[PDB]
Design an enzyme around this catalytic site. Sequence first.
Site, PDB file in Angstrom:
ATOM      1  N   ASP A  68     -10.957   4.446  13.699  1.00  0.00           N
ATOM      2  CA  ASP A  68     -11.412   4.512  12.283  1.00  0.00           C
ATOM      3  C   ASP A  68     -10.954   3.230  11.583  1.00  0.00           C
ATOM      4  O   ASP A  68     -10.986   3.210  10.328  1.00  0.00           O
ATOM      5  CB  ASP A  68     -10.954   5.796  11.560  1.00  0.00           C
ATOM      6  CG  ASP A  68     -11.591   7.073  12.089  1.00  0.00           C
ATOM      7  OD1 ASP A  68     -12.380   6.971  13.026  1.00  0.00           O
ATOM      8  OD2 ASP A  68     -11.276   8.173  11.606  1.00  0.00           O
ATOM      9  N   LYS A 107       0.833  -1.209   0.000  1.00  0.00           N
ATOM     10  CA  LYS A 107       0.000   0.000   0.000  1.00  0.00           C
ATOM     11  C   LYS A 107       0.865   1.256   0.000  1.00  0.00           C
ATOM     12  O   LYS A 107       1.808   1.354   0.854  1.00  0.00           O
ATOM     13  CB  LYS A 107      -0.836  -0.075   1.281  1.00  0.00           C
ATOM     14  CG  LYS A 107      -1.746   1.108   1.513  1.00  0.00           C
ATOM     15  CD  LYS A 107      -3.012   0.981   0.691  1.00  0.00           C
ATOM     16  CE  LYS A 107      -4.071   1.921   1.201  1.00  0.00           C
ATOM     17  NZ  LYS A 107      -5.117   2.040   0.177  1.00  0.00           N
TER      18      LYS A 107
END
Lengths: 307, 319
Positions: free
Chosen positions: A236, A108
């Site tokens: 989150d 990523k």
Amino acid sequence: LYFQSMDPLLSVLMWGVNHSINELSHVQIPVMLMPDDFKAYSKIKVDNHLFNKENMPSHFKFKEYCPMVFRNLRERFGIDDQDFQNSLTRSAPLPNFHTSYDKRYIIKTITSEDVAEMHNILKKYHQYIVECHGITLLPQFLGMYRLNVDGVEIYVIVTRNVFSHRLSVYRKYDLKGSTVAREASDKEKAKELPTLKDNDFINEGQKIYIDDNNKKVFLEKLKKDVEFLAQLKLMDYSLLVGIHDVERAAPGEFDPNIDVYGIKCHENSPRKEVYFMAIIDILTHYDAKVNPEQYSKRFLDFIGHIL
Amino acid sequence: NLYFQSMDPLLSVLMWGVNHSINELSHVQIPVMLMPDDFKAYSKIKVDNHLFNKENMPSHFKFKEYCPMVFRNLRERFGIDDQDFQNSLTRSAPLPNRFHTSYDKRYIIKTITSEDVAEMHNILKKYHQYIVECHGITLLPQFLGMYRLNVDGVEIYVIVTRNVFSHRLSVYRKYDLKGSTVAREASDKEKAKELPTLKDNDFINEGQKIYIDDNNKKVFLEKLKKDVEFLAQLKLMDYSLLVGIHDVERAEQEEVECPLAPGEFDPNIDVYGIKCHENSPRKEVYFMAIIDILTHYDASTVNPEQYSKRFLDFIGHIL
Ligand SMILES: CCOc1ccccc1-c1ccc(-c2nc3c(c(N[C@H](C)C(=O)O)c2C#N)CC=NC3)cc1
Ligand SMILES: CCOc1ccccc1-c1ccc(-c2nc3c(c(N[C@H](C)C(=O)O)c2C#N)CC=NC3)cc1
């Protein structure tokens, strides 16, 4: 192996990972990590003239963050450095984030802020991996790099795939327990395998059927993992869930040493399935910003609610 | 496994660089043939480590390799495998004599100047063509790698050549031979050492003979002539014949104190060795080749043609 790619940043990453691991082979494994190791790095700048001009870019840089810690993490997570090296280097990563060519690892692109947050938590994360003997649903952070080619600078992190290197996932969800509704877009839903969300799971009446022992084990790991995240003031994050359909198809099987997140469905399931679940996307701190204990409570209650 | 540790940070960087160069090459195709661009090519690597591998190596250094494709091809032409080469230069540190030898005594490592590097580029295309045309069979220096190193504010250029002497067999006498313009003999300070580099007058005044048979002498002098004609053409001069002599009986009495037979050697490894003839007073083995080739005429003194003739005339007279 020539590290060729149509994407110069993937050549450089394959080159870099190859270099990083070879370089580590010329470095002793310490009795234990020390504080300096958490603030460490290796930078390598390459300028070639009229050499290897076809396979690779002529001018580039590769930086590896805390190479000794990530090496230790790899060992703690049951990963051999040469297997790792081969996975990220024998063939180019495939864009879906990217996957190693053998589907073992996720690659990523992240921001400098993400990199700074990885540093912020790395000692506590590492100690937590030591304490839980590497048994956890946290992301396994295996390597963290900075790349510059062609005046373009990216940061990348590698993690273990939540999903099977082999068994396909017919369905995938990103779950948070948001009180506010979370639905996939029509654009996301237009994909072959969309990333669905909380309200999708509910509106589909999705059922995950695991046995009592597995659920207990899973929900205990999950609770400790999420108490840690709350302790660091991280939030989150999501539980990523993949569902393998054994009927579309030896058929049910997987190696729990490779696909470490795999759980067989309840024998009395109406549908023969395998589930792949773990936590992703943990690096958001409350300071940057409902609070972290609250997030973690709400998250954990929703997961409990679906099993 | 290998840490590249030395008290000499320049040896550490060299070991690391050779290791990195050979590994990098393992990821570049062997081309059907060299092209002009390969003769002006380089790779530069700048390494900066922070709180990482701080015991084994220097944290900040640079390593540059000249014409990697050509040196790899040269290595192949000279019969050398890149993995063997890598091991020879990295498994254990190079030993100081000024030059270093690889730990296994196959290779010579020398510090050279910027001018020397410039001269190596100047002749590299004709040198490579000449190595092609003689199938690698020459008494010229085998140039195997050329590097620029930077650490701790110190910059050096280095070149690697094949050792003239045996990797196994020890040398009890050695001479750097030119002939002609003289008073060329080793200093008092040099002749002090265990193995001094003796010169022309030492060869003559010490009564040094070389007992090779008629065939080996002729084969050797016919190579030397070719190589020396070649050097003349390039306008190079001030080169030597390096001669080393192994004494079988000495090597033996100096061992007994502490399967090739005594005095035998692998001619595929120790490529410069010549056995003594059957009537030698003592059993010996000679190691003889040209060294120190990179001086350009345009730089009383001789010219390259004159230099070459004097040299061949000199060597022809001592054998
Ligand atoms: C957006 C900021 O992302 C980060 C920032 C700092 C450090 C890490 C990350 C990060 C790393 C990896 C993943 C990730 N991991 C895995 C999967 C992912 N797939 C995505 C969600 C999909 O399928 O849509 C992804 C994604 N994206 C799929 C399967 N196993 C793992 C997610 C986030
Ligand atoms: C002075 C600048 O030197 C150079 C410049 C540009 C390119 C090459 C060189 C150079 C390279 C190698 C050697 C060399 N090669 C060999 C030996 C050497 N030993 C020395 C002379 C001794 O025994 O005294 C030496 C030495 N010195 C011994 C045995 N096989 C080879 C000599 C010169």
